[PDB]
Amino acid sequence: RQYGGLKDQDRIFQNLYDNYGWDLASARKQGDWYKTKELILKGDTWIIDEIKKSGLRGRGGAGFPSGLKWSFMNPPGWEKNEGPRYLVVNADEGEPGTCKDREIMRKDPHKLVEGCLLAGRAMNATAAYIYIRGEFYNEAAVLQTAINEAYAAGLIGKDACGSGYDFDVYIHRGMGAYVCGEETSLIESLEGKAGKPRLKPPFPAGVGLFGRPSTVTNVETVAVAPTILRRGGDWFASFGRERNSGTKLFCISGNVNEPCTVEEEMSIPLRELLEKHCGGIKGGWDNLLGVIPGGCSVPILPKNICEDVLMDFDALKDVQSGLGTAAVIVINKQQDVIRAIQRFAAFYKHESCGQCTPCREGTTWLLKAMDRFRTGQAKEREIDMLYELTKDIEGHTICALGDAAAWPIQGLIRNFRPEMETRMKKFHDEVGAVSVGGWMKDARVEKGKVVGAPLP
Amino acid sequence: DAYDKVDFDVPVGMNGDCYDRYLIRMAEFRQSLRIIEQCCNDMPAGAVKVEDFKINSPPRNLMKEDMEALIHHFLLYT
Amino acid sequence: WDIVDVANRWENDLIGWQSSGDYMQATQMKFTSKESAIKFANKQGWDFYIQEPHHRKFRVKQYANNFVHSYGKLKHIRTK
Amino acid sequence: VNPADRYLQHVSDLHQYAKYIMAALPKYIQGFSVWKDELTLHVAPSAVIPVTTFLRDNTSTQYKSIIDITAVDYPSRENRFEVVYNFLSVRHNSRIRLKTYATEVTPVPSIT
Amino acid sequence: KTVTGLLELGSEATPRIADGEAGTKALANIANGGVSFTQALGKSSKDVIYGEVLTVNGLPPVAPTLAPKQWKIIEGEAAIYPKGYPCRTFH
Amino acid sequence: HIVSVHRNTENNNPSIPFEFSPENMKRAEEVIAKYPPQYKKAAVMPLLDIGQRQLGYTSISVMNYVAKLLEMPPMRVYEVATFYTMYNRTPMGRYHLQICTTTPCQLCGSDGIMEAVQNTLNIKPGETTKDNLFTLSEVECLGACVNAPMMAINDDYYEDLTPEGTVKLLEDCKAGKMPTPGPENHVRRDCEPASGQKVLLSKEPHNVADFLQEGI
Amino acid sequence: GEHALRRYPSGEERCIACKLCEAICPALAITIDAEERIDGSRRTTKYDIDMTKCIYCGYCQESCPVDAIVETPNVEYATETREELLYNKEKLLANGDKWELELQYALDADAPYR
Amino acid sequence: AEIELTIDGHKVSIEAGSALIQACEKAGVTVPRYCYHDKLAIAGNCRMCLVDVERAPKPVASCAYPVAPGMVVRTDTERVKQARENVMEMMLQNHPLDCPVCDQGGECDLQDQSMRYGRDRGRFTEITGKRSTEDKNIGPLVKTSMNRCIHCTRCVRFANDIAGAPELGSSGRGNDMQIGTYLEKNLNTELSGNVIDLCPVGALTNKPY
Ligand SMILES: Cc1cc2nc3c(=O)[nH]c(=O)nc-3n(C[C@H](O)[C@H](O)[C@H](O)COP(=O)(O)O)c2cc1C
Ligand code: SF4
Ligand code: SF4
Ligand code: SF4
Ligand code: SF4
Ligand code: SF4
Ligand code: FES
Ligand code: FES
């Protein structure tokens, strides 16, 4: 039952390293657009049947099972609006640690195209928009060449593969905002305003893009769709645990000797992730300070328990933490964690859209406290206080950028408190003592500036 | 107001006249002096106003830098 | 009390204090009820006018009102 | 700590005492209110001399000392003034209040 | 009439109410003024009269004080005036 | 930071004219047709980008003109291009140093890369060279995280860098000849282990045409 | 004792016309009219204290956030007419001019305790 | 045609599909807020009207949560009082010390709700401190002092919807968001002195007064 080390023909993607080329005949003997005709003429509910017993959880970071996400879109009077229904593929990512989405579209644009049509048939969608990050210029050129050879082959368009079924893929490029990776801010950026999230009880599956019903699902989880439609749901369900089932791209980066991205089964021990396919850790297993599974937005696992841990949703959320997108940024012991988490808080301050007041006023205060804690101008209670003001942001926002910005600070305070107090006493008798707010008592406000303090 | 914590006795006259009303004042002098020395001996440290700034004002150290305290100072006086 | 036009207020010779000969200018009463105020007002023998209040008309609001589908001309661009 | 928490037991005592007094004079005591360590009997105007007599003379009450009596007008009521009476029992170390009402024209009977 | 309600229905410490569905309408007529108060004093038991209205021994409750003060007259030479003066120390 | 408020010195005027080169107007009429004919306004995000391809930057004439083109007040496009990072509004040189400084780059020596850039020039992270050839900007995660220290110039990424190697690359670009189209100087392909390849040990992919499910 | 409107270092009137001393005064002695001056700064056009209805509670000095009006310890200013005893803005600025050396000594010992 | 629910033990009937804030106003329950208004669209910016709702994991915004049957709403939850103090302290961190010079002294919504719902003291005492916003000359009728703005969008929603003057807006991200014309453009409309009664703080105020 030792989860790990899948074969090669049980892999979903075969171009993830580019030995086979990305073109259309490369995709034909890759094994795709092979029986498109028959699955589009299969029923929408049979597609949703198969996706439901697949156990296909969400791979955007939320983890929501997309069988029930795709069956939320059709209440039994859906034809009673009789207009255009849209699909949105979140091919944006900028989450630190992650490149697996670039790994899809640079290598494999074509089964993305396929899975877009196959999911649009599953949801009776009229068209589909691909939202690639505007930073990804060559990746957008890759995808437009591939979907135009899909137009040339007659595989999508007016009548997709001779099926009587409408389908248009358009590609929209979002000019550098990370909050637009969220569903509803994505919906708003595609309608052409500033990409701010809306509130949830207008659900997008009911009321969405252009005022028309819409889903936003990740580029991976629909690039996996035609494979698991072909292989069947229980061959996918064999991998992983009971509710945690199947495969995942893992991008392991940071301070590994060998940074690389894997395609590996879920529910796998972290030690035989980092040593099996990554060389090892830079300095061995005792040179592990901490580890971030997923992107920027989940807490640290300390070294004590991340030997025992599996990489599913279950064994990470009982470890108070998330799988996210399964980027794994390990921390060198010779590196500083509070410098890293100051960098994370600066990322959240720069990437916050600024709409609701607790997130926007919270990220600035988190940065102002984390610089002060990095050099050490603090009292030992203020770390206490820092915990309090992550509890303030935690559940009071529009989107999930607020609790995204809450979590790494919480993991730092839970796992590396003596690490912070060592730096603070280092400050306390390299320099004189400090008041609350970083003030020293020679520190005064003269003309303009503040003098007396080195002002972090 | 901390008369529990302070030990003293009470003068009470017997005939209802002006003389015993004089004597009990001349003794309440003594008892008040007893309070004064017991209260100078037993004086503690701590705050002298009530703790919150919604019924009496913040100190001027605080209301010149704290936004909340300037709001409370402005409202307790208007 | 309604103001007297000669006795209401005038500015002083000296410093410019607001001087007044009307003495009911600062008195103002509170009552729980409208019929309380009327009963007290004609019980004291006073000429009164009564002003009826004006409440707001109830209109149903949805947050999903903000982005409903345009079939013809948009005729509006929301911001949020 | 809440300052009202030190009163509670005595406040319960006060409740019981007042429930007795209303049961002893049902003809004359319209109501009572206990706020916090303070008892108020709500009594009608022609009912004031039989109640005060009781409060002076019952061995349980013995409210000997008159303290302070005054009026408060509520102009929104039919009976405009309410007349409050404060009594001290220096025996049992206890205070009581007696509230009646009066219009501008109609009297209250005097306890002089 | 709420004291009649406390005499006839009971208390939250002492509920003399079964029939919760019918106990609401048993509440209701006293809330309308069905019963009167001296009728409630006549209807009510003798050990409810001696339990809730009176003391458990049948005595009237004494006028309550918060903190009772027990006096102690100081009369020796710890007093403030020696004997022969018409004023006494009471402590 | 985001800097919003517009100064009207000169070279950013509503007085200054602007319009599309006919190639870009060809592209613009193609771009607007991707969206429903009601919601024309939805196409202002690419069209400003098209203006950013024509001019060196996004002026106020570009934003005013695309507000003219697409049934919009100009404050609605002022919001759109102020909310986004990639709409550079003040003029830059030719190459736009975008060095990533977030934790996967920071743990892998992005600071060595950035000071290897700003020892070469003498410019700070908002500053331009006064040759107006290079403009440094420290930037958040550019989506190349396993390619662990990296940067961007205009559209091409440059990865797996060494401070020995980036002074090499920028003396390449100050000579006019572009160094590599490739992502680094040739230690791996895209995402390889630098060892070699542990996974995908074949010369022909497995077809999934026989591994099919029985239900079709 | 008597009242004084202080000034900043390098001479500026300190009274930003916030009306707090007027709002708190238990005997309604303060009257102020305030206008925006030519600089765009907020100052009093008119400041006035009736010293016949002043009660010396010090609330006007406790209330001011800028600490613009204070009480000088002068009690020796007894007058012969009521008109002399109505202090406008100019008499109080002259007082805050005159007593400023002394008010330094007062507020060096009072300002922590305030 | 109507829906009956429970707020604070009170039972209230309201027309279907309305806002929970309208249910609370009908039941007499006072809920504090900063970016809701009767004559304007609904936004969930200010995060002040958070409320305890049975069958909901998080406190929901009472101004954009629609009315459903069988609803049990609590406003006096310890979680709700904690949430109101949290969001108030978050609002007060970058709001400048201008109460003696602000024109809304006894008429500030922020200030009267800070007594009733907010924290006693303040923990904002950094050396770096609050941000500062550039003053923006709009026109001769509206004085504009935008350090004390709370970004309630209310002026922008109004001049979008009702006045028909789309020149207002919100330009930026994070704390560098500003509320004004981006070019320093003068605002005309036939009712432009109505935005200054609308702003809850004194950021837009009266120029001759
Ligand atoms: C600030 C924020 C940023 C996000 N960025 C991304 C992203 O870059 N790529 C992605 O796939 N999901 C992202 N998400 C999650 C999206 O909402 C995601 O599209 C959705 O929740 C789930 O889609 P799924 O069904 O494929 O999981 C983000 C969420 C938030 C709150
Ligand atoms: S959480 Fe922050 S970035 Fe997200 S919508 Fe709210 S204010 Fe904007
Ligand atoms: S003296 Fe002080 S309280 Fe009076 S108006 Fe001037 S600043 Fe305000
Ligand atoms: S001392 Fe008291 S009465 Fe005199 S002006 Fe000041 S506040 Fe008013
Ligand atoms: S708007 Fe702000 S600065 Fe002005 S009075 Fe109100 S709280 Fe003070
Ligand atoms: S300008 Fe005023 S009304 Fe508009 S968002 Fe700012 S504070 Fe609110
Ligand atoms: S973190 Fe440097 S680009 Fe991904
Ligand atoms: S008013 Fe409901 S959140 Fe702003």
What labels would you give this structure?
part of a larger assembly, 8 chains, E: 91 residues, mainly alpha, 4 helices, 38% helix, G: alpha+beta, 3-stranded antiparallel beta sheet, 21% strand, binds flavin mononucleotide, binds iron/sulfur cluster, binds FE2/S2 (inorganic) cluster
**Total beta strand runs of chain D:** 5
The biggest beta sheet of chain D is recorded as: 5 strands, mixed
Distance between the termini of chain B: 29 Å
What is the share of helical residues of chain B? 40-55%
Q: What is the β-strand count of chain B? A: 1
SS field, number of helical segments of chain B: 3
What is the makeup of the main sheet of chain B?
A: none
Shape of chain B: elongated
Oligomeric state: part of a larger assembly
Strand content of chain B: under 5%
Radius of gyration of chain D using CA atoms only: 15 Å
Spatially, the strands of the biggest sheet of chain D line up as: 1-2-5-4-3
Describe the structure concisely for a colleague:
By secondary structure, chain C is largely without helices or strands.
Outline the structure in words:
It is classed as oxidoreductase. The entry lists the keywords Complex I, NADH dehydrogenase, Mitochondrion proton pumping, Ubiquinone, Oxidoreductase. The entry is titled "Cryo-EM structure of a respiratory complex I F89A mutant". Chain A is Subunit NUBM of NADH:Ubiquinone Oxidoreductase (Complex I). This is part of a larger assembly, with 8 protein chains of 8 kinds. Chain A is built from 18 helices and 11 strands. With 456 residues, chain A is α/β, with parallel strands linked by helices. In chain A, strands 6-5-9-7-8 form a 5-stranded mixed sheet, with no helix packed on it. Chain A has a 4-stranded parallel sheet with strand order 3-2-1-4, with helices on both faces. In chain A, a hairpin with a 4-residue loop joins β10 and β11 (450-451). The longest helix of chain A has 19 residues, at 357-375. A 5-stranded mixed sheet of chain D has the order 1-2-5-4-3. Chain D has 2 helices and 5 strands. The longest helix of chain D has 17 residues, at 8-24. In chain D, a hairpin with a 4-residue loop joins β1 (29-34) and β2. Chain D has helices spanning 8-24, 48-57, and strands at 29-34, 39-43, 65-73, 81-89, 94-102. With 112 residues, chain D is of the alpha+beta class. Chain G has helices spanning 20-24, 59-63, 89-98, 100-110; strands spanning 3-5, 30-36, 42-50, 69-71, 86-87. In chain G, the strands form 2 sheets. In chain G, strands 2-3-5 form a 3-stranded antiparallel sheet. The longest helix of chain G has 11 residues, at 100-110. Chains in contact: A-C, A-F, A-H, B-E, B-G, B-H, C-D, C-F, C-G, C-H, D-E, F-H, G-H. β1 of chain B pairs antiparallel with β1 (87-89) of chain E. One iron/sulfur cluster (SF4) binds at residues 95, 98-99, 102, 104-105, 108, 110-111, 148, 201-202 of chain H.
Layout of SSEs?
The structure is cut from a larger assembly and holds eight protein chains of eight kinds.
Chain A: H1 24-30, H2 36-41, H3 44-54, H4 66-71, E1 86-91, H5 100-107, H6 110-122, E2 127-133, H7 137-152, E3 169-174, H8 183-191, E4 214-218, H9 219-223, H10 225-231, H11 233-237, E5 247-254, E6 260-265, H12 271-274, E7 290-293, E8 301-302, H13 314-317, E9 327-331, H14 337-351, H15 357-375, H16 380-393, H17 401-415, H18 417-430, E10 444-445, E11 450-451
Helix pairs in contact in A: 14-15, 14-17, 15-16, 16-17
Chain D: H1 8-24, E1 29-34, E2 39-43, H2 48-57, E3 65-73, E4 81-89, E5 94-102
Parallel strand pairs in D: 2-5
Antiparallel strand pairs in D: 1-2, 3-4, 4-5
Chain F: H1 22-32, H2 44-54, H3 60-69, H4 74-83, E1 95-100, H5 103-106, H6 110-120, E2 134-139, E3 150-152, E4 157-159, H7 163-174
Parallel strand pairs in F: 1-2
Antiparallel strand pairs in F: 1-3, 3-4
Bound molecules: flavin mononucleotide, iron/sulfur cluster (5 copies) and FE2/S2 (inorganic) cluster (2 copies).
